[PDB]
Ligand SMILES: Cc1cc(N2CCN(C)[C@@H](C)C2)ncc1-c1ccc(-c2nc3c(CO)cccc3c(=O)[nH]2)cc1
């Protein structure tokens with residue numbers, strides 16, 4: 280459906296809040312930077328607010344159903360999502376028919392509290408072949424994009440190791456993978472696309488350390 284992208288000004292508190300969450304949640308990955316590249320900082324190019332009436336309608340309708348099953352609590356969290364399918368997401372919304380089958384919690388839609396974890400999926404699973412132009416997973420030239428999303432978690436089912444599932448457990452609305460001594464970083468899983476709204480579209484580069 281019809282999507283409008285509104286540019287946030289770098290001087291605005293809103294743009295600054297999104298960049299602060301993005302920059303401050305960067306951490307070192309176990310693959311030594313193979314999937315997302317080697318960097319300790321991003322160069323934020325643009326931050327846009329995604330406006331889509333039909334997506335907002337579907338998200339708000341689902342929030343009400345979740346609230347009803349969760350003592351009138353949405354349990355909403357702002358979380359990162361990196362994907363080669365950014366264009367489809369901002370126009371058509373998140374779709375569980377395009378879930379990550381290979382995911383450690385089964386065929387769900389995966390979100391991160393660490394921007395660096397989502398950066399590992401911008402070009403595909405495991406970084407795929409990298410940027411389309413230079414076939415480089417650590418490309419410092421190409422402008423990357425990721426989303427900072429409103430995610431309705433409702434009643435979360437907490438897990439610490441791999442358990443493949445198709446849907447959240449009975450009475451639950453999401454699955455959370457927690458880090459332990461185990462997972463390196465937390466993973467947030469929804470099994471219904473309408474439980475996430477792609478609120479912010481961030482255009483950035485990973486920065487090559489000096
Ligand atoms: C589902 C899929 C198919 C595909 N394909 C292209 C080639 N082909 C067209 C098909 C084979 C299909 N490429 C990428 C994805 C995909 C996209 C994003 C993620 C993703 N995962 C995350 C995780 C998983 O642990 C944790 C934390 C955060 C994230 C995150 O932000 N994003 C996973 C997979």
Ligand SMILES: [Zn+2]
Pocket residue numbers: 410411412413414415418419420421
């Ligand atoms: Zn490139």
